[PDB]
Design a protein around this ligand. Structure first.
Ligand SMILES: NCCCCCC(=O)O
Length: 90
């Protein structure tokens, strides 16, 4: 409402989040990215629907985690952290 600070309820499962980055890990690997060819969660994944992704880099909760998270690239290694989605609280 009003300013409507991009937030989510419980785990933003059904609702669609607008954030596309992890709290402090890094940016979110493009779901339809080629590096995710048939990988954990992606838009090019045969389960893209269940994944809850799409042609973008938004954060999601394909596993049903807390706040929609997203992949992140670390020191020569891959990762994924909670996205910086400002909860609604109350
Ligand atoms: N719960 C999301 C897991 C995402 C996997 C990312 C990785 O393999 O680093």
């Amino acid at each position: 409402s009003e300013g409507n600070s991009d937030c989510y309820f419980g785990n933003g499962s059904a609702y669609r989040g607008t954030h596309s980055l992890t709290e402090s890990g890094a940016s979110c690997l493009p779901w339809n990215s080629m590096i995710l060819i048939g990988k954990v969660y992606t838009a090019q994944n045969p389960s893209a629907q269940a994944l809850g992704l799409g042609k973008h880099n938004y954060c999601r909760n394909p596993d049903g985690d807390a706040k929609p998270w997203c992949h992140v690239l670390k020191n020569r290694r891959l990762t994924w952290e909670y996205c910086d989605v400002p909860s609604c609280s109350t």
